[PDB]
Every structure is written in structure tokens, then in C-alpha cells.
Design an enzyme around this catalytic site. Structure first.
Site, PDB file in Angstrom:
ATOM      1  N   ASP A  59      39.884  36.378  40.826  1.00 14.96           N
ATOM      2  CA  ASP A  59      38.979  37.241  41.564  1.00 14.96           C
ATOM      3  C   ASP A  59      37.587  36.621  41.547  1.00 14.96           C
ATOM      4  OD1 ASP A  59      37.794  39.613  42.786  1.00 14.96           O
ATOM      5  OD2 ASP A  59      37.208  40.206  40.763  1.00 14.96           O
ATOM      6  N   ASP A 108      38.924  41.415  37.171  1.00 15.02           N
ATOM      7  CA  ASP A 108      38.219  42.444  36.422  1.00 15.02           C
ATOM      8  C   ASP A 108      38.163  43.777  37.154  1.00 15.02           C
ATOM      9  OD1 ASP A 108      36.328  41.727  38.407  1.00 15.02           O
ATOM     10  OD2 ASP A 108      34.710  42.432  37.120  1.00 15.02           O
ATOM     11  N   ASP A 128      42.650  44.333  41.336  1.00 11.86           N
ATOM     12  CA  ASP A 128      43.350  43.202  40.752  1.00 11.86           C
ATOM     13  C   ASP A 128      44.547  43.609  39.908  1.00 11.86           C
ATOM     14  OD1 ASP A 128      41.593  41.074  41.698  1.00 11.86           O
ATOM     15  OD2 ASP A 128      40.110  41.924  40.338  1.00 11.86           O
TER      16      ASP A 128
HETATM   17  F1  ALF Z   1      35.788  39.192  44.111  1.00 15.01           F
HETATM   18 AL1  ALF Z   1      36.915  40.506  43.842  1.00 15.01          AL
HETATM   19  F2  ALF Z   1      38.006  41.890  43.749  1.00 15.01           F
HETATM   20  F3  ALF Z   1      37.835  39.877  45.183  1.00 15.01           F
HETATM   21  F4  ALF Z   1      35.993  41.240  42.493  1.00 15.01           F
HETATM   22 MG   LIG Z   2      35.889  41.840  40.619  1.00 17.73          MG
END
Ligand code: ALF
Ligand SMILES: [Mg+2]
Ligand SMILES: CCCCCCCCCCCCCCCCCC(=O)OC[C@H](COP(=O)([O-])OCC[N+](C)(C)C)OC(=O)CCCCCCCCCCCCCCCCC
Ligand SMILES: CC(C)CCC[C@@H](C)[C@H]1CC[C@H]2[C@@H]3CC=C4C[C@@H](OC(=O)CCC(=O)O)CC[C@]4(C)[C@H]3CC[C@]12C
Ligand SMILES: CC(C)CCC[C@@H](C)[C@H]1CC[C@H]2[C@@H]3CC=C4C[C@@H](OC(=O)CCC(=O)O)CC[C@]4(C)[C@H]3CC[C@]12C
Ligand SMILES: CC(C)CCC[C@@H](C)[C@H]1CC[C@H]2[C@@H]3CC=C4C[C@@H](OC(=O)CCC(=O)O)CC[C@]4(C)[C@H]3CC[C@]12C
Ligand SMILES: CCCCCCCCCCCCO[C@@H]1O[C@H](CO)[C@@H](O[C@H]2O[C@H](CO)[C@@H](O)[C@H](O)[C@H]2O)[C@H](O)[C@H]1O
Length: 1030
Positions: A416, A735, A739
């Protein structure tokens, strides 16, 4: 495709099934658990689906579901309801009941849902809850404790109790029982934690036909209810469509981004409402409403569309609930067929030896427990326990220690972006002033600016308030005012250490103008000063054309093409008197006109300082780093180039897919953007279009894909699963709640959050950096190496004891309960625990540990070590028979009656050394562990056990009463035995070295493996041969 099989029941048939499966034998229950088709054909008669009380749902996977009648027949399969429609004579899923209904159909629901309608719709759809089942300890035990291995351990314990082998049976029983109890506790606690996580109980206001409004629990919400959204905001209790008003929503639970998303009322048309087409008019369950505006009418209206598991959050939770070891199991099966062969030979020799029938059965069955070690999984788990303790010391918490072994297999880690690779929030990158009519260089320190219009505009043009002696308000406003160094005290501001300026009035920030205005003044001024701050392209239309630079749009796009948050500021000298008696009676439109653009403020989400080192270390060890973010593709691409996922010499290609409209099919558009060597970047929509319409191009996309942006949580899960289908061992590091599916679906999922993501992840880290990923990979490589070593030792240990017991059975003797106990408990437990002890190597290498126990190295090592063991044991046995002092063993009696005798004495004296030799030989150091000589407890234990055995051989009467050993007075023969065990020691170490060194070279130069079994390696080969995008 699915198939529904209907089964009713007959009471006589039910009792008959129960008695035939209980009183006759217990095996039929396990036979029906292995194939439930026979159980349902025996217990239940086949019935027409219209009258069925039991359904077999098969998707090959087989499931059985009970049919529940309220009348309303329905059933639940993986959280989804399938109600029985009598007119259509089928179990229709409730997700499809109002599918394809128009936007006018949704708008007609704005008056609410009656109580009769709400009751029938709650009968149909159920309560607006995500109900996670927490099984009881018996119900949870029936799943685990019915492992085939646990059955083998129970058989072995029963055999050892029948054979007066009580102490090792007690040890194995205690180990297995504590393991089962720990597993049950962990599983039930995880279920309870997830249930508490997904639980949402809140009071909601629903419209009822007739003009009334009713406060109900959020669980009383059914599709078709009209929610009254609170103006102050709150958590969204279900999926809904706005029909009246507008909303600002924090959709981080879906995207991972805390930026406010504007939701507007659904448009009235005769077209089917769609949650993806009308995503900007849809309020999703779990997202946070920041504020709601009711422009027309009294209050903000949203029509409930999906509840329970039918929500996007419900789908994520359902995916969470309903998603080396292979070779270990096959090697255990080979050990079992060897057990069968050795049991046949044992029966033959023991019948030759005139052994009674019950004793023949006991001995032949004990041979099976000998060659198939019941203590193998605990020995395999000790190393994971050590790794788990080391990880918890490093701040990484693992709930299932056996998942650590998967860290040694990872070839690809997904990340992420926000909060994982980059910081949680934005940081002040700078402010772009203006001197005259042209832009100035970006100023990273806004408080370094002179005391002019732009500084005070950054400091005082906001809507902050002081609360708990702390400024509270808009987050970007808070950060910019912290950057300016000015401290809050309408309002007044003191400079960082000038004249303190006081606000004269303030016009609020509206989502329509999307800009803010204030009026400030100070003692010693000529006239009040008005500031304006908002969207830069919207502020640029209010200032004078001789103040806005000609390079404005290009600079703004150059800033925003990297994911920056630009916000413009402007000001005006006002001819108004410096007094609040006129300055608060100003209309805002006159203030917004004839501005002077002061400059831009550029805010960015910074990359964490630990990200780029970790990403470059992963790419240096040939581990793929893949960004899978819910953010936009421009920010994702900029951060991926920033953290080294895409090196500057490497090429990045954007893959753009278009939905197939009427008359033309879907297409793949490749647009190379200027700065392995080839990386692909695509969005969630593109990912889905490729999954659906380009299933043959999908593997190339997954093998070259580096940036996956604008991904939904289910799309993250689908990406992880599709990469695992390419035989990748996938790691996920995130986090956020978005996710959770990818963290549960990944082989190694590491959670950087302590909330709502720790529940589903195997690993959780206390540090917010991705430095946990190399730590987990190092510990996993060490644990996989150590587990290979422990498995090889237990296999060798099992075979050595097998050879010993066969040699002794042939002559109508055995080893001895206390010699058995020494070998089984003291030597084996000490060895296993102190082998598993050593920690990971300090450096990650490019080569990863082998993941196959059936490998040619492992099998060759085992076979050659066992050849040497068998040779030493048979040579010692036949050297003992050649001695002049040797006397046979009185075959007329059987063990332990003929003990002590020379044959068992020599066989035990040799094999007991062999166990330590094999222990030391299978252990390794570099590259995945610390050097073997650093394992001081293990070497000291080996030396002490060796000294005890040398005393058994040399010192007369030493433990020979207890161990039922025979005294040999020939010191030359004892020195010959010690020389034979020294030969075995040297030969075992030389065999291990020769194999580990020259066997790979021989396997390569002898038979070249041009094609790997991995699907992604074959894809990389054919992409290197023919690059897909020309
Ligand atoms: F950058 Al993300 F969920 F895609 F925190
Ligand atoms: Mg995130
Ligand atoms: C006698 C038992 C006393 C020590 C038991 C300690 C249990 C433990 O912490 O392990 C939990 C772990 C958790 O495993 P899990 O399966 O719950 O994950 O499982 C075990 O209990 C394994 C015990 C390892 C000891 C085996 C030694 C045999 C060597 C040959
Ligand atoms: C049949 C019976 C007699 C067997 C009993 C075996 C136990 C005594 C073994 C099995 C698992 C072993 C544990 C495996 C893991 C660890 C972790 C270890 O601590 C660390 O690794 C910290 C290192 C760091 O954080 O840097 C301390 C020993 C300990 C508890 C071992 C202690 C001895 C244990 C409990
Ligand atoms: C009459 C005879 C047959 C009974 C023998 C008694 C056993 C229960 C004793 C003898 C040797 C003991 C073992 C001696 C060595 C070790 C290693 C020890 O490892 C650690 O302490 C971990 C520390 C670290 O790694 O930092 C754990 C206990 C254990 C297996 C002991 C478990 C209990 C054992 C098997
Ligand atoms: C009568 C009694 C005193 C018998 C004593 C036997 C010892 C001489 C044996 C038992 C275990 C043996 C050790 C087992 C394994 C190691 C590790 C080995 O290290 C390596 O293989 C190099 C790379 C690495 O460490 O991984 C060096 C030999 C050594 C200490 C051996 C040295 C000789 C030892 C101490
Ligand atoms: C690695 C080697 C470990 C060797 C461990 C040996 C320890 C055994 C000590 C237990 C003593 C039991 O005592 C012994 O019991 C046996 C029955 O088993 C009797 O027979 C013996 O006459 C008695 O001396």
C-alpha cells in the site's frame, strides 16, 4: 456454474443412519467427513428442490447448507442469502432482487418505507449486520483435532500405552494437547476480535411514508429505507444513494485516502442505478461522513441500497471469511509405505522367532511409530517459535508462527502507498511567491519569507479554532499554520517571535465556491487587508490578469502531475475604514472580485525515510516490489519512481483499458511515459477490464505490473490471488481497512496498523515503516533453512532407529524401554530444540532457500547418510559376531528378557552416537543462518551427550543396569567401536560438504532444466524472448 441438490429427511432413516454410524464403528463418521456425498445420500433421502430441507452446494468444491423457513424458505452460503421464489421455483440470491432498477425507482424511495414493507424486507434481506460466526470450542476442535496426523499420534500413544512406553507417550500427549488448546484459543480469539471489529451498532433516522421519521437501530435498515443523514456527519451504516442534498465523505476505509470526497444527489433518469456508474452519488458502509448539506428540503436523504453482507464492506468481510508442506506430507506417506514393508518383514521374522501373536502385533505396529516419528511437527515448530520470539523482540508480532516459514519463499511483495510507503498525511513542501507578474522559486520555508501579504495570508486565512489549548480545524490549514511559525491567540495572531494582526471578519469555506475569505488588519496599517484561499484555478479567475502569470496553468499541472495538493492565495487592499463597524458588513462577492494572486502553497505526502532503502534492498535481492494503492495513478507513479520501484533507467508504460461500449469491444491502450527494465502501471478499472476481457494478456500484465492504482479492496485481494495463481509467493504490506483482504489472502501479510488490519494479518509491526519486510524475510529464510535441517534430522533419526530395531528384531531382541527413552527423549529433544536455536544471518542474499523437501539435494543427503548409518551399524554388528569373547543372545526368550546382550549393546552404542552425528551434520550456517560454531549451547550439548556415550562405552557399569547394557571387557574392541563412530562422524560431515558443494554443479551440467515449474518464470522467459507491448 452451481448445482443445487435437494434432500429431505425421514425419522426412521435418521435414527438408522445415526445407529449404523455410531454403534457399528466410528470410521464411517470420518469416511463421511472425507466425502459428505455418501453421508448425505445415507442420512437424507433425495427430495425435490421445492420441498428440500438440505442442499448440496457445489461450485471442485462441495458444500452442504441447511434450508431455513420463516413462510419464507431461504439459506445462507458464505454470508449471502438465497431466498426461494415460489413463482420462479428457484433459490434466488437477494443481491439480485432489485438489480437494474432505475434512478427514478431509487428517487421514489425518498418518502421512506412503511412498517409492513420494512418487516417483509427484513424477512427477505435479514438484519443490517455483518454476522461473523464464533464457533464453540468443541465445534472448533472437530476441525483441527481431526487432522490425520493427530489421529496417527493418538494411535501411537495408544500403542505405547499398550506397550508400557508410558513416559514418551505422556510427552507426546502433553505436546499435542497443549498445541491443540493453543490453536483453539487463538482461533476463537481471532474470531471474536474480527466480530468486534465488523460490528456496527448505531441509531439511524429513517423516513416513514406519511411524513414521519423514526429512530431505529442501524440493523433495522433494509434496502428501500430512506436514511436521514445527520448534518454533523458520522459513520455510514449501510450502502445508500443520495437522492437529496450533498455530502463530504472520508472514504479511507475503501481507498486508504482521508481526502474529503464530494457526494452529490443521484440524477433522476430512467436508467438502472449502478454503484460503480453512480459512485459519486453512493454512500458506502463504513465510510465516514464529514458533513452533509441540505440545499433543497429540510434534511439530507439517502436511499438504502445494500445491507449486511451485500455492502462493499460486507463483500470485503466475506472475502476475509471465505478465501514444502506438500512435500512433507508426501515424504510422510513414503515413510508410511516403508512402514508397511518393514511391518511385513517384522511379522515374518517374529513369527519365525516363535513370538506370540499379540506380541507380534505390538512389535510390528510399534515399528510404524518408529519409522514415522510422532514428534515431527513439534520439532518443526520449535524453529518457528524461536523466530517468533526474535520477531517480537524486533517489534513484529506473529499470531501463527508457522507462517514465518513462508517468508523464506517470498519472491514478490505488494505495498500500500499511503501510510505504508509514504507518510499518513501531507507535509508543507513550500510556497510559491510572486514578485511582480511572474512566479518566484519555490520557498521550502514559508516562515523564511518577509513580513508581507503572502505570509499573513498563509497565517490568518483559515477557519481554525483553539480547543484544549491546541489549534483544531481543517488539516491542511493546521499544517500550513504550523509551517508559518505563527501562533494562534474575531481572532489575533502573533508572529513567530513584526506586529500581531487581528482578524476583522471571516467568510466560511463552501463546497460550491471551494474557496475561503478573511479580512485582517493591524495597528500601524493604511487599510484592512482581505485574504482569499482556495482551489488555484478557481482563485486565478478572480484576480487581475496583470497579476496571474501566463505560466500559471502549466506550472499548476506540473505540480499536480506528481500528486501535489496546490492551493492558491490572494489578497486585496480595501478602501474600507480600519474598523469592524464596516468591515463585518461587507458582502463577500465584492471581496472575491479584483483580487491579486499572491501565490501557491504546495503540499505533498512525503515518502518515509525507511522506504527507499528497503525497496532497493528488495530489488537488490531480486524480490519484486509492487505498489497496489487506492490512490490515483499519477501520485502512485510519482511515488513508485521516488521509492525506487521504477528506477530512472527503467521504462514505465501506462496500460489504459476502455470498457466495451455498444458496437466496439474492449481495447488495451499503451502510452509510454517519459522518465525488470519494463514496468506496467494501470488503474483498478483497467485491471478489471483486463481480468474480464483480456484473460490471455492478464498474466503478462501481472508479471510486468509494478503500479496498481485506484484499486478497490476486492481488487487488491484479486491481484494478490491472481499473482499467487502465477505461483508467486506473495507478500502484502499495508496499514488500512482497504488492505485487509490482500493481507488475509497473501502468503505473508504484514500489518503496519494496530487497528482493524491487525486482526486479519499474520504479522503486525509496531514500526510504521516497511523495514519489517526485510526482517520477516530474513527470519523466514532462517526458519525455512532450520526446518529443512530439523526435518532431515528427524527423518534420519527415524531411519536410524528403524535400522536398529530391524537388526535387533531379526535376532529376536529389541532395543530396550530405557534405551528407547534415552534416544527418543534426551537425545532427540535436546538436539531438536538446540538445532532450532540459531538466529538469522545479518545480510539478505539474492539466493533464497529451497522450498521443496522432495528436492534431489534433500533426498540424496538423506539416502547417503542412511547408507553410511546402515553400513556402520551392520559393520559393528558383524564385527561383534566375529569376536572370540562373543556369545549369542539366547533367542529362546524375547526382549526385554534376553537383555542385556552384546548385540543390543553394540547396536545401541553405535546408533546413539549416530544420532548426534546426524544432528551435527544436517545443521547449517551461512547463508540463511549464523555460523554453526556460534551455536554454543548446541555444540556444548553435543559434546556432553557424546561424553556420556563415551562413558557408556568405556566406563564399566556406567548406566548399564538402567540401560540394560552388557559389559564388554575387550578395550581394543571398544576402541574399534569408537573408531567406527569417528569414521561415521567424519564421513557424514564429508558427505554433507561434498553434496552441498558439488551436487548443484553436477545437477546443472548433467541435466539442464531449461524450463522452470513456476508460471511467472516461464512468462518472464517468453517476455524476454518476445516483449509483449512492442
Ligand atoms: F495508499 Al493506500 F490504501 F492504497 F493507503
Ligand atoms: Mg494506507
Ligand atoms: C511439556 C510441554 C511444555 C512446553 C510446551 C510449550 C508450548 C509452546 O509454547 O508451543 C506452542 C506451539 C504453538 O503452535 P501452534 O500450532 O498453536 O501454532 O505449539 C507447540 O506447543 C509446539 C511444542 C514444541 C515442543 C516440541 C519438542 C519436541 C522436540 C522433538
Ligand atoms: C518433551 C518435553 C520435555 C519437551 C520440552 C521442550 C521445551 C523446553 C522447548 C520447546 C520450545 C522451546 C522454546 C522455543 C523458543 C524459545 C524462545 C527463546 O527466546 C528468544 O529467542 C529471544 C531472542 C531475541 O529476541 O533476540 C527462549 C527459549 C524458548 C522459549 C524455548 C525454551 C524451551 C522450549 C520451551
Ligand atoms: C530417565 C531419563 C530417560 C529422563 C530424562 C529427563 C528429560 C526430561 C531431560 C533430559 C535432557 C533434558 C533436555 C536438556 C536440554 C534441553 C534444551 C533446552 O533449551 C533451552 O533452554 C533454550 C534456550 C535458548 O535457546 O536460548 C530446553 C530443555 C531441554 C530439551 C531438556 C528437556 C528435558 C530433558 C529432555
Ligand atoms: C568424548 C567427548 C569429549 C566427545 C567430544 C566431541 C566433539 C569434539 C565434537 C561434538 C560436536 C562437534 C562440533 C560439531 C559442529 C561444529 C561446527 C563446525 O563449523 C563449520 O562447519 C563451519 C561453518 C558453520 O559454522 O556453519 C566446526 C566443528 C564443530 C564445532 C565440531 C567440533 C567437534 C565437536 C565439538
Ligand atoms: C543420553 C543417555 C541418557 C541416559 C539416561 C539414563 C538415565 C536412567 C536413570 C533412571 C534409573 C532407573 O533405574 C533403573 O531402572 C531400571 C528399569 O528401567 C532397572 O532395571 C535398573 O536396575 C535401575 O537401575
Amino acid at each position: 456454474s452451481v448445482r443445487l441438490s435437494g434432500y429431505c429427511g425421514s425419522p426412521w432413516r435418521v435414527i438408522g443412519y445415526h445407529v449404523v454410524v455410531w454403534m457399528m464403528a466410528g470410521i464411517p463418521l470420518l469416511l463421511f467427513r472425507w466425502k459428505p456425498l455418501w453421508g448425505v445420500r445415507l442420512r437424507l433421502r433425495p427430495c425435490n428442490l421445492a420441498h428440500a430441507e438440505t442442499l448440496v452446494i457445489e461450485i471442485w468444491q462441495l458444500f452442504t447448507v441447511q434450508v431455513q423457513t420463516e413462510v419464507l424458505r431461504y439459506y445462507l452460503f458464505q454470508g449471502q442469502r438465497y431466498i426461494w421464489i415460489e413463482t420462479q421455483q428457484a433459490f434466488y440470491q437477494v443481491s439480485l432482487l432489485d438489480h437494474g432498477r432505475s434512478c427514478d425507482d431509487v428517487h421514489r424511495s425518498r418518502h421512506g418505507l412503511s412498517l409492513q414493507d420494512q418487516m417483509v424486507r427484513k424477512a427477505i434481506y435479514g438484519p443490517n449486520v455483518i454476522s461473523i460466526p464464533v464457533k464453540s470450542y468443541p465445534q472448533l476442535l472437530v476441525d483441527e483435532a481431526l487432522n490425520p496426523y493427530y489421529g496417527f499420534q493418538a494411535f501411537s500413544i495408544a500403542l505405547w500405552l499398550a506397550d508400557h512406553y508410558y513416559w514418551y507417550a505422556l510427552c507426546i500427549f502433553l505436546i499435542s494437547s497443549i498445541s491443540i488448546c493453543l490453536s483453539l484459543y487463538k482461533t476463537r480469539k481471532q474470531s471474536q476480535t474480527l466480530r468486534d471489529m465488523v460490528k456496527l451498532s448505531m441509531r439511524v433516522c429513517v423516513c416513514r411514508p406519511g411524513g414521519e421519521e423514526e429512530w431505529v437501530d442501524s440493523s433495522e435498515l433494509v434496502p428501500g429505507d430512506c436514511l436521514v443523514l445527520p448534518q454533523e456527519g458520522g459513520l455510514m451504516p449501510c450502502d445508500a444513494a443520495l437522492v437529496a442534498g450533498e455530502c463530504m465523505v472520508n472514504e479511507s476505509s475503501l481507498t486508504g485516502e482521508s481526502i474529503p470526497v464530494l457526494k452529490t444527489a443521484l440524477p433522476e433518469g430512467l436508467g438502472p442505478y449502478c454503484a460503480e456508474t453512480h459512485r459519486r452519488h453512493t454512500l458506502f458502509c463504513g465510510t465516514l461522513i464529514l458533513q452533509a448539506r441540505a440545499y433543497v428540503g429540510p434534511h439530507v436523504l439517502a436511499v438504502v441500497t445494500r445491507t449486511g453482507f451485500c455492502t462493499a464492506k460486507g463483500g470485503l468481510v466475506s472475502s476475509i471469511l471465505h478465501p514444502f508442506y506438500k512435500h512433507s506430507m508426501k515424504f510422510v506417506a513414503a515413510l508410511s509405505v516403508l512402514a508397511l514393508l518393514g511391518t511385513i518383514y517384522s511379522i515374518f521374522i517374529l513369527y519365525r522367532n516363535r513370538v506370540p501373536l499379540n506380541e507380534i502385533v505390538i512389535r510390528a505396529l510399534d515399528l510404524v511409530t518408529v519409522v514415522v516419528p510422532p514428534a515431527l511437527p513439534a520439532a518443526m515448530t520449535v524453529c518457528t517459535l524461536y523466530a517468533q520470539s526474535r520477531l517480537r523482540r524486533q517489534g513484529i508480532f506473529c499470531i501463527h508462527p508457522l507462517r514465518i516459514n513462508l517468508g523464506g519463499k517470498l519472491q514478490l511483495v505488494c505495498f500500500d502507498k499511503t501510510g505504508t510507503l509514504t507518510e499518513d498525511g501531507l507535509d508543507v513542501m513550500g510556497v510559491v511567491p510572486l514578485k511582480g507578474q511572474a512566479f518566484l522559486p519555490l520557498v521550502p520555508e514559508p516562515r523564511r519569507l518577509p513580513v508581507g501579504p503572502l505570509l499573513r495570508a498563509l497565517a490568518t486565512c483559515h477557519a481554525l479554532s483553539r480547543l484544549q489549548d491546541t489549534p483544531v480545524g481543517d488539516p491542511m490549514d493546521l499544517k500550513m499554520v504550523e509551517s508559518t511559525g505563527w501562533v494562534l491567540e474575531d481572532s489575533a495572531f502573533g508572529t513567530q517571535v513584526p506586529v500581531p494582526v487581528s482578524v476583522l471578519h471571516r467568510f466560511p469555506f463552501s463546497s460550491a465556491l471551494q474557496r475561503m475569505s478573511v479580512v485582517v488588519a493591524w495597528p500601524g496599517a493604511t487599510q484592512p487587508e482581505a485574504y482569499v484561499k482556495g482551489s488555484p484555478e478557481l482563485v486565478a479567475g478572480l484576480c487581475n490578469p496583470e497579476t496571474v502569470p501566463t505560466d500559471f496553468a502549466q506550472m499548476l499541472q506540473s505540480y499536480t502531475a506528481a500528486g501535489y495538493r496546490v492551493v492558491a492565495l490572494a489578497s486585496k487592499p480595501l478602501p474600507t475604514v480600519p474598523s469592524l463597524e464596516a468591515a463585518q458588513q461587507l458582502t463577500r462577492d465584492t471581496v472575491e472580485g479584483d483580487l491579486s494572486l499572491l501565490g501557491l502553497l504546495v503540499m505533498r505526502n512525503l515518502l518515509k525515510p525507511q522506504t527507499t532503502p528497503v525497496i532497493q534492498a528488495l530489488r537488490r535481492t531480486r524480490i519484486r516490489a509492487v505498489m497496489v494503492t487506492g490512490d490515483n495513478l499519477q501520485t502512485a507513479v510519482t511515488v513508485a519512481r521516488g521509492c525506487g520501484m521504477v528506477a530512472p533507467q527503467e521504462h514505465l508504460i501506462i496500460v489504459h483499458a476502455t470498457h466495451p461500449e455498444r458496437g466496439q469491444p474492449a481495447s488495451l491502450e499503451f502510452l509510454p511515459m517519459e522518465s525488470r527494465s519494463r514496468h506496467l502501471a494501470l488503474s483498478g478499472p483497467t485491471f478489471g477490464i483486463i481480468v474480464k476481457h483480456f484473460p490471455k494478456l492478464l498474466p503478462k500484465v501481472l508479471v510486468q505490473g509494478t503500479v496498481f492504482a485506484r484499486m478497490a479492496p476486492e481488487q487488491k485481494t484479486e491481484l494478490v490471488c491472481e499473482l499467487q495463481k502465477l505461483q508467486y509467493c506473495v507478500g502484502m504490506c499495508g496499514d488500512g481497512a482497504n488492505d485487509c483482504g490482500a493481507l488475509k489472502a497473501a502468503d505473508v501479510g504484514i500489518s503496519l496498523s494496530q487497528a482493524e488490519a491487525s486482526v486479519v494479518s499474520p504479522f503486525t509491526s509496531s514500526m510504521a515503516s516497511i523495514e519489517c519486510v526485510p526482517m520477516v524475510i530474513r527470519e523466514g529464510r532462517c526458519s525455512l533453512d532450520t526446518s529443512f535441517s530439523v526435518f532431515k534430522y528427524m527423518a534420519l533419526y527415524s531411519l536410524t532407529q528403524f535400522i536398529s530395531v530391524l537388526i535387533l528384531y531379526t535376532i529376536n531382541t529389541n532395543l530396550g524401554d530405557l534405551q528407547f527413552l534415552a534416544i527418543d527423549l534426551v537425545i532427540t529433544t535436546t538436539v531438536a530444540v538446540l538445532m532450532s536455536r540459531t538466529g538469522p544471518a545479518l545480510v539478505l542474499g539474492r539466493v533464497r532457500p529451497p522450498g521443496a523437501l522432495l528436492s534431489v539435494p534433500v533426498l540424496s543427503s538423506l539416502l547417503l547418510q542412511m547408507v553410511l548409518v546402515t553400513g556402520v551399524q551392520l559393520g559393528g554388528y558383524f564385527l561383534t559376531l566375529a569376536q572370540p569373547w562373543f556369545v549369542p543372545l539366547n533367542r529362546t526368550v524375547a526382549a526385554p528378557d534376553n537383555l542385556p546382550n552384546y548385540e543390543n549393546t553394540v547396536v545401541f552404542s553405535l546408533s546413539s552416537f549416530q544420532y548426534l552425528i546426524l544432528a551435527a551434520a544436517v545443521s547449517k550456517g551461512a547463508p540463511f543462518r549464523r555460523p554453526l560454531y556460534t551455536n554454543v549451547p548446541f555444540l556444548v550439548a553435543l559434546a556432553l551427550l557424546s561424553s556420556v556415550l563415551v562413558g557408556l562405552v568405556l566406563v564399566p557399569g556406567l548406566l548399564q543396569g538402567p540401560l540394560a547394557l552388557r559389559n564388554i571387557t575387550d578395550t581394543g574392541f571398544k576402541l574399534l567401536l569408537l573408531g567406527l563412530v569417528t569414521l561415521n562422524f567424519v564421513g557424514a560431515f564429508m558427505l554433507e560438504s561434498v553434496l552441498d558443494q558439488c551436487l548443484p554443479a553436477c545437477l546443472r551440467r548433467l541435466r539442464p532444466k531449461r524450463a522452470s515449474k513456476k508460471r511467472f518464470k516461464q512468462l518472464e522467459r517468453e517476455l524476454a524472448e518476445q516483449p509483449w507491448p512492442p
